[PDB]
């Protein structure tokens, strides 16, 4: 998913 990917980004 696109979101689970943005989340992975925030955690760095």
């Amino acid at each position, epitope marked *: 998913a*696109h*979101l689970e*990917n*943005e*989340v992975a*980004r*925030l*955690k*760095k």
Partner: antibody, heavy 112, light 110 residues
Framework: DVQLQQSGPGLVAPSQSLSITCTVS????????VNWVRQSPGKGLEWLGV???????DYNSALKSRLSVTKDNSKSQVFLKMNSLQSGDSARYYC???????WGQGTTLTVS | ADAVVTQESALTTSPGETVTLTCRSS?????????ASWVQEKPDHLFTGLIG???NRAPGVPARFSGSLIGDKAALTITGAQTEDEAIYFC?????????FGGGTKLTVL
């Protein structure tokens, strides 16, 4: 640090449209998505749309027919076009990151 | 059609105190799939993202800001407010193919 710079003529005049360009830095459009949002005076924020890394697009169900969001992955740009503008479209337009973490300086649009 | 996102209109606190801003969804309990996010609007329409995806701090964001889910709602908590933290707080939920913003909560730090 990532930065988002808004530009483009914007325009004005009713019946015509708005055109905004958002240049990003600090990350590639191939990996993550960019959102578009606007806020009209006294009123709250409203999501307009997002364009993901893989090119897929999601729009605000009630404005869908009047807007188009495209991007050039190589130039790190994202374009927003909204047509058939009306007084109610007057507002401040912002381009933002995937979870609204980073913001662009915004662009003011006065229609009519 | 789509859901309504509800936030308290106003909240007030004081330096060093703790406060909790909430976010309700008209479709039922808020969940991790709603990827709750929070942005702060300061005078001059200065926007900054605080929390993204329920409990992740947008890099550069002071650690006093935390987020989580409590009793069917999303929550942003400021542990030990400061005077600069006075602003309007917006919550945003995701519904499979779109975001919906709450009406915002004006926070006063006396």
């Amino acid at each position: 640090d990532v930065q988002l710079q808004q530009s483009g003529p914007g325009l004005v005049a009713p019946s015509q449209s708005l055109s905004i360009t958002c240049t990003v830095s600090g990350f590639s459009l191939t990996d993550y998505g960019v959102n578009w949002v606007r806020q009209s005076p006294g009123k709250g924020l409203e999501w307009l749309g997002v364009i993901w890394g893989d090119g897929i697009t999601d729009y605000n169900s009630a404005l869908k027919s009047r807007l188009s969001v495209t991007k050039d992955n190589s130039k790190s740009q994202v374009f927003l076009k909204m047509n058939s503008l009306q007084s109610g479209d007057s507002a401040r337009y912002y381009c933002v990151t995937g979870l609204f973490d980073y913001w662009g300086q915004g662009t003011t649009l006065t229609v009519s | 059609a789509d859901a309504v996102v509800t936030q308290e209109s106003a909240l007030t606190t004081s330096p060093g105190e703790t406060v909790t801003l909430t976010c309700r969804s008209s479709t039922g309990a808020v969940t991790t799939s709603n990827y709750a996010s929070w942005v702060q609007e300061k005078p001059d329409h200065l926007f900054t993202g605080l929390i993204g995806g329920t409990n992740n701090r947008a890099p550069g964001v002071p650690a006093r800001f935390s987020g989580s889910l409590i009793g069917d709602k999303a929550a942003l908590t400021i542990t030990g407010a400061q005077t600069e933290d006075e602003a309007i707080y917006f919550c945003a939920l995701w519904y499979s193919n779109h975001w919906v913003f709450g009406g915002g909560t004006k926070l006063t730090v006396l």
